[PDB]
Amino acid sequence: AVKKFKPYTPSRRFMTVADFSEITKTEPEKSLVKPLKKTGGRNNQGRITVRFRGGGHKRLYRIIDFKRWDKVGIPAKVAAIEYDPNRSARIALLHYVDGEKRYIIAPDGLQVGQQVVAGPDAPIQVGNALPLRFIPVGTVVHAVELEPKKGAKLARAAGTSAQIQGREGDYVILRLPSGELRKVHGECYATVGAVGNADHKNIVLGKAGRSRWLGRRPHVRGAAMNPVDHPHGGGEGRAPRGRPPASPWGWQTKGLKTRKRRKPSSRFIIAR
Amino acid sequence: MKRTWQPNRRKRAKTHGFRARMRTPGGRKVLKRRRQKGRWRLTPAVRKR
RNA sequence: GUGGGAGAGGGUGGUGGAAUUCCCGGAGUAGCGGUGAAAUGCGCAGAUACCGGGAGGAACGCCGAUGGCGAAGGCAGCCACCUGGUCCACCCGUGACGCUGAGGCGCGAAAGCGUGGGGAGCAAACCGGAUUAGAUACCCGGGUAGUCCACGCCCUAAACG
RNA sequence: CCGAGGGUAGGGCCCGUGACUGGGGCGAAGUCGUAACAAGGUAGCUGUACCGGAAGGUGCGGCUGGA
RNA sequence: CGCGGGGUGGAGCAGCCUGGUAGCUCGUCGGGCUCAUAACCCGAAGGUCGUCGGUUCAAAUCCGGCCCCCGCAACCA
RNA sequence: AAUGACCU
RNA sequence: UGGUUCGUGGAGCCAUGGGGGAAUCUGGGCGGACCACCGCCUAAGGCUAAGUACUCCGGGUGACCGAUAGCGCACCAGUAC
RNA sequence: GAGCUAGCCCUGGCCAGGGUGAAGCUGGGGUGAGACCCAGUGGAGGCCCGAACCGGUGGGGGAUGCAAACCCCUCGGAUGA
RNA sequence: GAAUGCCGGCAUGAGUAACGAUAAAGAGGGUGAGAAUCCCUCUCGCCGUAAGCCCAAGGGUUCCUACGCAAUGGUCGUCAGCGUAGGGUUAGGCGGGACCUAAGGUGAAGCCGAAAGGCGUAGCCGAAGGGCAGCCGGUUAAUAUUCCGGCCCUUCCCGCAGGUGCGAUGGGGGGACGCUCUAGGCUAGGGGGACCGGAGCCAUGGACGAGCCCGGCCAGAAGCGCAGGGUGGGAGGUAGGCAAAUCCGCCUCCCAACAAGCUCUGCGUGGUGGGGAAGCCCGUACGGGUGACAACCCCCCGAAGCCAGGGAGCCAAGAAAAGCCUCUAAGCACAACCUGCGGGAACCCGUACCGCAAACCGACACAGGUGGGCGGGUGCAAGAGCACUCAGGCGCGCGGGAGAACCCUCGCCAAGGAACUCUGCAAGUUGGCCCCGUAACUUCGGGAGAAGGGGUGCUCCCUGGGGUGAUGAGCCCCGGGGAGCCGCAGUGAACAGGCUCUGGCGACUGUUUACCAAAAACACAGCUCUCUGCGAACUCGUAAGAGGAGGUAUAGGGAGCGACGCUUGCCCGGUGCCGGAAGGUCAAGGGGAGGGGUGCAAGCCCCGAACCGAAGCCCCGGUGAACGGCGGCCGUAACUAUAACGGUCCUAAGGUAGCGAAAUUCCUUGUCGGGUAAGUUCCGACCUGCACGAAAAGCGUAACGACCGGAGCGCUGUCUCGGCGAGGGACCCGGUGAAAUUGAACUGGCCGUGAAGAUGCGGCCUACCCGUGGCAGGACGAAAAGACCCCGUGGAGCUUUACUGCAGCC
RNA sequence: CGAUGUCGGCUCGUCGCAUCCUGGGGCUGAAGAAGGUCCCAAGGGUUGGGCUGUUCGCCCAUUAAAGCGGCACGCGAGCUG
Ligand SMILES: NC[C@@H]1O[C@H](O[C@H]2[C@@H](O)[C@H](O[C@@H]3[C@@H](O)[C@H](N)C[C@H](N)[C@H]3O[C@H]3O[C@H](CO)[C@@H](O)[C@H](O)[C@H]3N)O[C@@H]2CO)[C@H](N)[C@@H](O)[C@@H]1O
Ligand SMILES: [Mg+2]
Ligand SMILES: [Mg+2]
Ligand SMILES: [Mg+2]
Ligand SMILES: [Mg+2]
Ligand SMILES: [Mg+2]
Ligand SMILES: [Mg+2]
Ligand SMILES: [Mg+2]
Ligand SMILES: [Mg+2]
Ligand SMILES: [Mg+2]
Ligand SMILES: [Mg+2]
Ligand SMILES: [Mg+2]
Ligand SMILES: [Mg+2]
Ligand SMILES: [Mg+2]
Ligand SMILES: [Mg+2]
Ligand SMILES: [Mg+2]
Ligand SMILES: [Mg+2]
Ligand SMILES: [Mg+2]
Ligand SMILES: [Mg+2]
Ligand SMILES: [Mg+2]
Ligand SMILES: [Mg+2]
Ligand SMILES: [Mg+2]
Ligand SMILES: [Mg+2]
Ligand SMILES: [Mg+2]
Ligand SMILES: [Mg+2]
Ligand SMILES: [Mg+2]
Ligand SMILES: [Mg+2]
Ligand SMILES: [Mg+2]
Ligand SMILES: [Mg+2]
Ligand SMILES: [Mg+2]
Ligand SMILES: [Mg+2]
Ligand SMILES: [Mg+2]
Ligand SMILES: [Mg+2]
Ligand SMILES: [Mg+2]
Ligand SMILES: [Mg+2]
Ligand SMILES: [Mg+2]
Ligand SMILES: [Mg+2]
Ligand SMILES: [Mg+2]
Ligand SMILES: [Mg+2]
Ligand SMILES: [Mg+2]
Ligand SMILES: [Mg+2]
Ligand SMILES: [Mg+2]
Ligand SMILES: [Mg+2]
Ligand SMILES: [Mg+2]
Ligand SMILES: [Mg+2]
Ligand SMILES: [Mg+2]
Ligand SMILES: [Mg+2]
Ligand SMILES: [Mg+2]
Ligand SMILES: [Mg+2]
Ligand SMILES: [Mg+2]
Ligand SMILES: [Mg+2]
Ligand SMILES: [Mg+2]
Ligand SMILES: [Mg+2]
Ligand SMILES: [Mg+2]
Ligand SMILES: [Mg+2]
Ligand SMILES: [Mg+2]
Ligand SMILES: [Mg+2]
Ligand SMILES: [Mg+2]
Ligand SMILES: [Mg+2]
Ligand SMILES: [Mg+2]
Ligand SMILES: [Mg+2]
Ligand SMILES: [Mg+2]
Ligand SMILES: [Mg+2]
Ligand SMILES: [Mg+2]
Ligand SMILES: [Mg+2]
Ligand SMILES: [Mg+2]
Ligand SMILES: [Mg+2]
Ligand SMILES: [Mg+2]
Ligand SMILES: [Mg+2]
Ligand SMILES: [Mg+2]
Ligand SMILES: [Mg+2]
Ligand SMILES: [Mg+2]
Ligand SMILES: [Mg+2]
Ligand SMILES: [Mg+2]
Ligand SMILES: [Mg+2]
Ligand SMILES: [Mg+2]
Ligand SMILES: [Mg+2]
Ligand SMILES: [Mg+2]
Ligand SMILES: [Mg+2]
Ligand SMILES: [Mg+2]
Ligand SMILES: [Mg+2]
Ligand SMILES: [Mg+2]
Ligand SMILES: [Mg+2]
Ligand SMILES: [Mg+2]
Ligand SMILES: [Mg+2]
Ligand SMILES: [Mg+2]
Ligand SMILES: [Mg+2]
Ligand SMILES: [Mg+2]
Ligand SMILES: [Mg+2]
Ligand SMILES: [Mg+2]
Ligand SMILES: [Mg+2]
Ligand SMILES: [Mg+2]
Ligand SMILES: [Mg+2]
Ligand SMILES: [Mg+2]
Ligand SMILES: [Mg+2]
Ligand SMILES: [Mg+2]
Ligand SMILES: [Mg+2]
Ligand SMILES: [Mg+2]
Ligand SMILES: [Mg+2]
Ligand SMILES: [Mg+2]
Ligand SMILES: [Mg+2]
Ligand SMILES: [Mg+2]
Ligand SMILES: [Mg+2]
Ligand SMILES: [Mg+2]
Ligand SMILES: [Mg+2]
Ligand SMILES: [Mg+2]
Ligand SMILES: [Mg+2]
Ligand SMILES: [Mg+2]
Ligand SMILES: [Mg+2]
Ligand SMILES: [Mg+2]
Ligand SMILES: [Mg+2]
Ligand SMILES: [Mg+2]
Ligand SMILES: [Mg+2]
Ligand SMILES: [Mg+2]
Ligand SMILES: [Mg+2]
Ligand SMILES: [Mg+2]
Ligand SMILES: [Mg+2]
Ligand SMILES: [Mg+2]
Ligand SMILES: [Mg+2]
Ligand SMILES: [Mg+2]
Ligand SMILES: [Mg+2]
Ligand SMILES: [Mg+2]
Ligand SMILES: [Mg+2]
Ligand SMILES: [Mg+2]
Ligand SMILES: [Mg+2]
Ligand SMILES: [Mg+2]
Ligand SMILES: [Mg+2]
Ligand SMILES: [Mg+2]
Ligand SMILES: [Mg+2]
Ligand SMILES: [Mg+2]
Ligand SMILES: [Mg+2]
Ligand SMILES: [Mg+2]
Ligand SMILES: [Mg+2]
Ligand SMILES: [Mg+2]
Ligand SMILES: [Mg+2]
Ligand SMILES: [Mg+2]
Ligand SMILES: [Mg+2]
Ligand SMILES: [Mg+2]
Ligand SMILES: [Mg+2]
Ligand SMILES: [Mg+2]
Ligand SMILES: [Mg+2]
Ligand SMILES: [Mg+2]
Ligand SMILES: [Mg+2]
Ligand SMILES: [Mg+2]
Ligand SMILES: [Mg+2]
Ligand SMILES: [Mg+2]
Ligand SMILES: [Mg+2]
Ligand SMILES: [Mg+2]
Ligand SMILES: [Mg+2]
Ligand SMILES: [Mg+2]
Ligand SMILES: [Mg+2]
Ligand SMILES: [Mg+2]
Ligand SMILES: [Mg+2]
Ligand SMILES: [Mg+2]
Ligand SMILES: [Mg+2]
Ligand SMILES: [Mg+2]
Ligand SMILES: [Mg+2]
Ligand SMILES: [Mg+2]
Ligand SMILES: [Mg+2]
Ligand SMILES: [Mg+2]
Ligand SMILES: [Mg+2]
Ligand SMILES: [Mg+2]
Ligand SMILES: [Mg+2]
Ligand SMILES: [Mg+2]
Ligand SMILES: [Mg+2]
Ligand SMILES: [Mg+2]
Ligand SMILES: [Mg+2]
């Protein structure tokens, strides 16, 4: 839906906030299962190695369930859907009859009170997790494992999915959010449905501060700098570059493919 | 204005203390040099309890 | 009111096959496209033609009409749901409740604008190859918005009987 | 007290004028092309869009005021 | 003032550097097609190569001096 | 595969 | 690749990161590519005094200084600052 | 050497008092149902005025200064990057 | 004898500048060898969201007292933060440690690295965070939440007494959390009182009076009372909480639905304890006595603090661990554990004093910098604003005169009112509140405090709402109406916008050259390009490893553009990057035709052509929100002028829309038009654009701007053109007393001359000796081994299709 | 070049005359008036605004006139910037 504001201030005239109506009466989270201390820090042991990180709201990590094959066969009741500061998506709090409480990343269409479960069994319904094999060709799916028993790694961003395209002996072909065509092992779990919160892309930050709230420090142009700092630094009053556009570290930034050629992963990929 | 000396007993101790110098080869040599020199004070005297 | 009737009427979901294009494998050569004629173009880096597999989008051949439905715009593969108008029969109920309609309100082809999605074919603009005295055109090879979808705008028409 | 009027400030409508600019009407024999009327030599007209010295061209849909 | 590129029929351009032959397009003129004009077709004419000097057997061409044409430079003060 | 000065 | 006077030179010898990979006296290396001849040695385990180097320390001496010199310090100096 | 300065991490603190009045909620109105319109309430905002507080705009003073960056007047921000 | 030489000493300027805020002094009396400066008293001035008070940091003896003044104090000094000595810092309850965890550090296991060393789950370390039991008074010259008094707690250990399955570093619960706005009731704090207590005072015209003045409080266990916070109770089933569990979790039935009940805080009250002014008298540097058997009461205002884990809303979604509660495992159930009560036990370190400053950081008794808490009263709309002022603390460690120039800071002005000037620079006008009243434009918010106006004090009368209160008096908040008084003037002092018109740039709040640039630069949302399928790309590191990210294409990295609106054309020839299982070239390696050196020979050792050989380049294509580029010459219309049209050369393509003498225009003050009396600027146009132009974006844009330009109104000392006055210096007297500079000096003008600008040489002219206040023309004045320029085969930063390597990648 | 601060403005002036005005004079194609032109003469005077950093210049309104030039394109230990 997206919340919109009137221009009672500049920067309030474009600003735009998510709709939280799917956030069920459960705004503060769940101890026990999560949260952990989350360790803010824009850099490695010592030095900054990703520029322009820092500031922005304190967070608690929700330790979510990315391998659903523990509770094969054990169903769970979806108890709530809550805000997760550390991902684009929303998260489902679910209660297993087992007693155990996990969070699942919350797919589009998930309703509270719903039944959900994981395993070879598993009715093909939104929320359920299955090894890729038993899932019908052509159904859209998410939180897909890359290699079996290694955890969900594909399609967890808000409003993303992959579609099952066909099969090939032990592998089923996937079409990933990027549009790539991937052979992913049959035995990999993946949960049916799309991610949801799909209006995430429609949000307009609206002002500088908002950027900072999310811990995004000001990014400065190479043009703004000096020859010591950047290939684009200097010279006089503005300058068009004077070389093929580059990163600060000298590599070209328009076109230069960067995936290494001889990756053994290659023989499992069929697209862009 | 604000000058450059902003005394702190803990800082002076953690930074220039006998135990800090002892911790690394760089520092151990400092004690060696100061000893051979005949320095009355190997490290700065940080006070208080 | 009761009982029925025909319909591409409308909205949503799902699904079928033919064909074009692209990809992969096979087999296979010296040309293929195209025109009034050509050339640009594609092709010995393995093309066109043929076969097997895959992907995808759009439009629904025959039925089809000089036909049907709708208030107009307009509506056509099939399936199910939701849903408007309408025709007949019976003469059962109400009992003049009627007609029109300034303004209002709603709908409204195509092109066009906004946001996101999609993009096979086609194709403004654009680039070529011709044709001509010259061609910013007609012809030919390419090709982008657009054409498709969702939501929101635009309010026009030889919106014509 | 109200009060003609004078004053200051700011609006509303109307008229005149203005370098320059837009298209228009009109003026016997100047220029460029051939758009339309005969299938006018690419059926025409049309709403919209884009393009072109100019008529105009083309895309999309529509009309018979064409076969 | 300096630099380096340029003047060729009526128009626009070749031809120079590897000296001896000046060619392309348009235009002009004569004829044809047409009722006529244009388009088109057939024939034909047309060039002191800016000047002045000479190097050579021979200069559009190579070399010097001027004259116009264009382009660049004219900085630190 | 264009064009046909003006009035009558 | 380093080491040797040896900087790729005709470039050996000695050490060695990589690859291949023997032999036990009729076995192996060396005498400056290499081959023949004549010779010299016996690798791939180790230890080993003395002659040698230095002067925190003690002693001796000086065609060495004599408090702006001589060690930064003759004096409570690596102190005061 | 990050006890000055720059950035980030952990944990605390601070921001007088005034204005303007977004959403929403509630009532009334409108419609077939709506959209919407009125009040009333409500208290949003890198919103306004202005101390603390963070700055350093213009001018003057100061120039062996009170000060190796200061002083007076004036000024920007002041719930937020 | 020179090296702007080196160390030292002493000169010159010089009794010169200065004596560190313009908050301010005067007198009397002491002490003393010596008083502007020390002590005391009276008067005056200054601070009072402090210039008062209490903490933290830092400092470390500066605290107190006795004795002293050489030096330190910008003067003096009997004084001191100084010298000599002595004294002073008392805790189970305050803070820190025999408690906990954060970032981070360290680090057993483990991984890595020539060495040194680098990582690293557990654990440990690590605090203005969590946990934890003291409140009110009295005492010392100097310490007190520490000693003492009163009242009240907490831990252990040994006992008895009574309960229960007790029992872990282990399971769970809890601890436990944002921001903004907030309700109810309290407390802190404060105002008033005819009421209670109190020495006292009638002044100078009046007042012996609900007269003036002072004070009417603080703590307090149980028990109550009032506020509020936490929380459901059962019974079964159980596969999760990594062994077990009765605990928790999930499921199902009952009962509550409520704070009803348990609790737990806060606040009142509480046995009782303590305190308790003005003034008066005293002798202290200061405190003492009395006032007192002090009184200790009623109203009102009232927090930002408490009840706290209260409530509502919002998005950016808001530490951890121990204590504590509970569960059970090994064990043990003569142990142990809980509760009551007695006795005993309760260590280590800090405690002085300064602390917005003369004791900390600035070399200084430095006009600067320094975190937290309290910060009273009155008025001004409010307030931590401003004026005055309680408490409390200061008059800033040179004074005394004078009354010049000049400077600083300040006040006023005739008439004119920007004529000043680069520019209204500066200064002025404007200024609070209430009520009227407001334009273009606009993104519908704004613009708006638009602009422009009027009201504002005091008195008396009538009158409307609330709060606290019984529905009442008062006491306290907001109002309305009518009369009338005074002055030049009513936010009568202080605090408190000048305004409008039109351009340029950037959307905007923001950021930056600490110490000459705050901007049109940077950032910014937002737009596009491109890389990245996850052990991601990328970055850091030799590595291990870490960031990215406990993220996964709606995500992450890189690049350019920079809200928004309308748009962003043509060229792929060159450069880049992307795509091409062909071909050409291509190193090591493979292959050996063939040849060479030696050997009597087997042999041994060298070269070596075919041919097979990667990436890269060549070659074929693609791609411009990739690097980038986007023409010239002739002629033509029935007046001229001009050129829609034509010819020709060239290119990879020949700049489209929109703008255009521009932050871009050389010629240039282009040419018209507008503002002006006059306008190299400004605004609007024309286009001949030297040399705009579409993401180094193009043309616009409401709002915003300590940005930059032009204009007008208001108002003025900016000016005509100055004048006067004020205070701080300047000057004179007393006290202390520098500095840069300095070849030496007995240091005049002119016309000459000279290395071409002479006090110093020549001629002439003038001129007694020495100071004081002033002015700056000269001493090519001081200050810095010229910044510019060149020189040196000097040095650094930067660039690239310079050379040559290297990392990285292939 | 071990430093001679460099434009313009302001302030303060001062000098040369090849005089802008005012005084004297000759010729004039000087009727008069007002001009032209030359010679003598610097004693005094030589305005206020608009634009520009401007010097200069062009304007507006005047005037008897709106002089030219030197003094390190006079003058920053005097200011401005
Ligand atoms: N005429 C009315 C409107 O204006 C235009 O018409 C104007 C022009 O286009 C037109 O020009 C014509 C030209 O087309 C034609 N081929 C040649 C002719 N000599 C010209 O003629 C014009 O010019 C001449 C002199 O200058 C005058 O004397 C004469 O009156 C005038 N019509 O003349 C008209 C002026 O009178 C539109 N073409 C026309 O269709 C439109 O409706
Ligand atoms: Mg590191
Ligand atoms: Mg470290
Ligand atoms: Mg940036
Ligand atoms: Mg820069
Ligand atoms: Mg660079
Ligand atoms: Mg430039
Ligand atoms: Mg550059
Ligand atoms: Mg139907
Ligand atoms: Mg094939
Ligand atoms: Mg009937
Ligand atoms: Mg009708
Ligand atoms: Mg429509
Ligand atoms: Mg359409
Ligand atoms: Mg569209
Ligand atoms: Mg978008
Ligand atoms: Mg096509
Ligand atoms: Mg033709
Ligand atoms: Mg075509
Ligand atoms: Mg469009
Ligand atoms: Mg008009
Ligand atoms: Mg025609
Ligand atoms: Mg036609
Ligand atoms: Mg036609
Ligand atoms: Mg059309
Ligand atoms: Mg076209
Ligand atoms: Mg002819
Ligand atoms: Mg220079
Ligand atoms: Mg014609
Ligand atoms: Mg005719
Ligand atoms: Mg006629
Ligand atoms: Mg060597
Ligand atoms: Mg060697
Ligand atoms: Mg060599
Ligand atoms: Mg080896
Ligand atoms: Mg050997
Ligand atoms: Mg050997
Ligand atoms: Mg040998
Ligand atoms: Mg030999
Ligand atoms: Mg030997
Ligand atoms: Mg041996
Ligand atoms: Mg030995
Ligand atoms: Mg001697
Ligand atoms: Mg000595
Ligand atoms: Mg001596
Ligand atoms: Mg010495
Ligand atoms: Mg820091
Ligand atoms: Mg406020
Ligand atoms: Mg507010
Ligand atoms: Mg509202
Ligand atoms: Mg604000
Ligand atoms: Mg503000
Ligand atoms: Mg403010
Ligand atoms: Mg405060
Ligand atoms: Mg700053
Ligand atoms: Mg100054
Ligand atoms: Mg301020
Ligand atoms: Mg000498
Ligand atoms: Mg000396
Ligand atoms: Mg004196
Ligand atoms: Mg003097
Ligand atoms: Mg003096
Ligand atoms: Mg003095
Ligand atoms: Mg003083
Ligand atoms: Mg006062
Ligand atoms: Mg002492
Ligand atoms: Mg003392
Ligand atoms: Mg004493
Ligand atoms: Mg003294
Ligand atoms: Mg002093
Ligand atoms: Mg004495
Ligand atoms: Mg003392
Ligand atoms: Mg102990
Ligand atoms: Mg500890
Ligand atoms: Mg840790
Ligand atoms: Mg750790
Ligand atoms: Mg370590
Ligand atoms: Mg610990
Ligand atoms: Mg604590
Ligand atoms: Mg404690
Ligand atoms: Mg004390
Ligand atoms: Mg006690
Ligand atoms: Mg138990
Ligand atoms: Mg626990
Ligand atoms: Mg009396
Ligand atoms: Mg009282
Ligand atoms: Mg009490
Ligand atoms: Mg268990
Ligand atoms: Mg008393
Ligand atoms: Mg709460
Ligand atoms: Mg622990
Ligand atoms: Mg103490
Ligand atoms: Mg104390
Ligand atoms: Mg003090
Ligand atoms: Mg303080
Ligand atoms: Mg002092
Ligand atoms: Mg101070
Ligand atoms: Mg000090
Ligand atoms: Mg402070
Ligand atoms: Mg106050
Ligand atoms: Mg008050
Ligand atoms: Mg106020
Ligand atoms: Mg104040
Ligand atoms: Mg005046
Ligand atoms: Mg006056
Ligand atoms: Mg005036
Ligand atoms: Mg002026
Ligand atoms: Mg002037
Ligand atoms: Mg101005
Ligand atoms: Mg001003
Ligand atoms: Mg305005
Ligand atoms: Mg800005
Ligand atoms: Mg600066
Ligand atoms: Mg600024
Ligand atoms: Mg500044
Ligand atoms: Mg944009
Ligand atoms: Mg990692
Ligand atoms: Mg991570
Ligand atoms: Mg990105
Ligand atoms: Mg930019
Ligand atoms: Mg472009
Ligand atoms: Mg290319
Ligand atoms: Mg190109
Ligand atoms: Mg190409
Ligand atoms: Mg390639
Ligand atoms: Mg080879
Ligand atoms: Mg070989
Ligand atoms: Mg032989
Ligand atoms: Mg190759
Ligand atoms: Mg122009
Ligand atoms: Mg003009
Ligand atoms: Mg003016
Ligand atoms: Mg004018
Ligand atoms: Mg203009
Ligand atoms: Mg230009
Ligand atoms: Mg530009
Ligand atoms: Mg561009
Ligand atoms: Mg821009
Ligand atoms: Mg603007
Ligand atoms: Mg700003
Ligand atoms: Mg600004
Ligand atoms: Mg004045
Ligand atoms: Mg005066
Ligand atoms: Mg005075
Ligand atoms: Mg003399
Ligand atoms: Mg001379
Ligand atoms: Mg002389
Ligand atoms: Mg002499
Ligand atoms: Mg004198
Ligand atoms: Mg002088
Ligand atoms: Mg002076
Ligand atoms: Mg001088
Ligand atoms: Mg000098
Ligand atoms: Mg020099
Ligand atoms: Mg130099
Ligand atoms: Mg050289
Ligand atoms: Mg010089
Ligand atoms: Mg000198
Ligand atoms: Mg004369
Ligand atoms: Mg005369
Ligand atoms: Mg004169
Ligand atoms: Mg001016
Ligand atoms: Mg000049
Ligand atoms: Mg002069
Ligand atoms: Mg000159
Ligand atoms: Mg000068
Ligand atoms: Mg300047």
Short mmCIF file of C-alpha atoms (C1' of nucleotides) in Angstrom, two decimals, chain I residues 366-410:
data_model
loop_
_atom_site.label_atom_id
_atom_site.label_comp_id
_atom_site.label_asym_id
_atom_site.label_seq_id
_atom_site.Cartn_x
_atom_site.Cartn_y
_atom_site.Cartn_z
"C1'" C I 366 46.82 33.90 31.08
"C1'" A I 367 40.02 38.19 29.39
"C1'" G I 368 40.90 31.16 26.31
"C1'" G I 369 39.17 25.31 27.11
"C1'" U I 370 36.81 21.99 30.92
"C1'" G I 371 31.35 16.74 32.06
"C1'" G I 372 27.03 16.16 35.99
"C1'" G I 373 23.56 17.97 40.01
"C1'" C I 374 21.03 22.57 42.96
"C1'" G I 375 20.43 27.44 41.10
"C1'" G I 376 15.55 31.37 45.77
"C1'" G I 377 12.39 36.36 45.17
"C1'" U I 378 9.79 40.35 42.06
"C1'" G I 379 8.08 42.01 37.63
"C1'" C I 380 8.15 41.76 32.18
"C1'" A I 381 2.67 36.80 27.71
"C1'" A I 382 6.27 32.53 28.96
"C1'" G I 383 11.25 30.88 30.36
"C1'" A I 384 17.20 28.41 32.57
"C1'" G I 385 15.41 35.20 28.54
"C1'" C I 386 16.06 40.41 30.68
"C1'" A I 387 16.25 44.35 34.85
"C1'" C I 388 16.82 44.49 40.18
"C1'" U I 389 17.71 41.41 44.18
"C1'" C I 390 17.87 36.54 49.02
"C1'" A I 391 21.69 33.29 50.41
"C1'" G I 392 26.54 33.39 49.28
"C1'" G I 393 30.69 35.51 46.96
"C1'" C I 394 33.29 39.40 44.71
"C1'" G I 395 35.47 45.15 43.41
"C1'" C I 396 39.31 41.33 38.97
"C1'" G I 397 47.40 42.27 43.08
"C1'" C I 398 50.09 49.06 40.70
"C1'" G I 399 48.18 53.76 42.45
"C1'" G I 400 47.89 59.34 42.31
"C1'" G I 401 46.74 63.61 39.31
"C1'" A I 402 45.60 66.12 34.99
"C1'" G I 403 41.21 67.14 31.27
"C1'" A I 404 46.06 68.39 24.87
"C1'" A I 405 46.58 66.08 19.83
"C1'" C I 406 45.33 61.15 18.45
"C1'" C I 407 43.06 56.11 19.04
"C1'" C I 408 39.53 52.98 21.29
"C1'" U I 409 34.52 52.15 23.18
"C1'" C I 410 29.89 55.49 23.72
#
